[PDB]
Design a protein around this ligand. Structure first.
Ligand SMILES: CC(C)[C@@H](NC(=O)[C@H](CS)NC(=O)CCC[C@H](N)C(=O)O)C(=O)O
Ligand SMILES: [Cl-]
Length: 329
């Protein structure tokens, strides 16, 4: 028997406006959700999601094996030593069903000082031939800034919810240095479906991706209308309903650190479903040198003894660790 998690739908539109009292009522809902299962759906968000799934499937189903190799990250192509994060993540027929494409801050170019310095976690995006995928790059870059704007407002909600000024988080979230990433994931329908691609959980549940905490400040996710996600509660794993018009939001391990675990990073996993579906996370990461001073909203004095963490090194350790634990994606 598997229960369903309480994931409220929060109208976040006041976070874009100037009704400060209305914003506090949104922050309260974010507070409650972060203290419950950790998840909530952001609705009335103003982003056009109507074609996100189609474009994601179109791009994945129309890209050729030759193109995949030419864009593949280092894990799949030894000739691309600089592509650790951005590029194509090939499937492995018979062994690995998922495939995806990851891109970073469009402002990361050869002129960027972090690219010039070869700083870890910074890379220049690789893109397919414009003529083979017309309008794909323009769409991708515009979506990055569309979800950036949504994420900036959500961070204002989290800051107010924690008793801080609305810019407590967003001030470190900037277009000229953010390490945030978009991933365009395709989960294919396969018949037969290779068992080597399915993992069996301790509780017997068949999975495509095992338990983990997110490496982010917050995660802003859109998915097609196929239920798959689960959150661990003390009463066991609980199904997270799908909502192909809203954005599923949750806190990452960086938030759990700086809040002294007041807003825990929920443990989540992906159930195996034999169906064609798309998953498009936006990982809200700060700058490489961004540092937020921890605090404890549970203490009268609000003091925390935790060490302030540079976000860049945190992201570098988090991503490698996640690959080491749940495998290369
Ligand atoms: C559960 C979803 C978020 C999705 N999973 C994911 O996107 C998973 C877990 S958060 N993400 C990762 O493994 C880390 C990707 C980091 C990215 N290449 C980068 O360099 O920034 C899925 O649908 O499998
Ligand atoms: Cl202090």
């Amino acid at each position: 028997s598997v229960s369903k998690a309480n994931v409220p739908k929060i109208d976040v539109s006041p976070l874009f406006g100037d009704d400060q009292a209305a914003k506090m009522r949104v922050a309260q809902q974010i507070d409650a959700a972060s203290r419950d299962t950790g998840f909530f759906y952001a609705v009335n968000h103003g982003i056009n999601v109507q074609r996100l799934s189609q474009k994601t499937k179109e791009f994945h189903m129309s890209i050729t094996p030759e193109e995949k190799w030419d864009l593949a990250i280092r894990a799949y192509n030894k000739e691309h030593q600089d592509q650790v994060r951005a590029g194509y993540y090939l499937s492995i027929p018979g062994k690995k069903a998922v495939e995806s494409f990851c891109y970073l801050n469009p402002n990361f170019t050869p002129d960027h000082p972090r690219i010039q310095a070869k700083t870890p976690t910074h890379e220049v995006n690789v893109w397919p031939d414009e003529t083979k995928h017309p309008g794909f790059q323009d769409f991708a870059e515009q979506y990055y800034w569309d979800v950036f704007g949504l994420s900036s407002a959500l961070l204002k909600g989290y800051a107010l919810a924690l008793g801080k000024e609305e810019n407590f988080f967003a001030r470190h979230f900037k277009p000229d240095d953010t390490l945030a990433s978009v991933v365009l994931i395709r989960y294919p329908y396969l018949d037969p479906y290779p068992e080597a691609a399915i993992k069996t959980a301790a509780d017997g549940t068949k999975l495509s991706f095992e338990w983990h905490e997110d490496v982010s400040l917050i995660t802003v996710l859109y998915q097609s209308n196929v239920q798959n996600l689960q959150v661990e509660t003390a009463a066991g794993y609980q199904d997270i309903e799908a909502d192909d018009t809203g954005y599923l939001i949750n806190c990452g391990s960086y938030m759990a650190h700086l809040t002294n675990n007041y807003y825990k990073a929920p443990i989540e996993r992906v159930k195996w479903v034999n169906a064609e579906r798309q998953s498009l996370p936006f990982f809200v990461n700060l700058g490489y040198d961004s540092v937020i001073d921890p605090f404890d909203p549970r203490e009268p004095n609000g003091k925390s003894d935790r060490e302030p963490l540079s976000y860049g090194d945190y992201l570098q350790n988090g991503l490698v660790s996640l690959i080491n634990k749940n495998g290369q994606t």
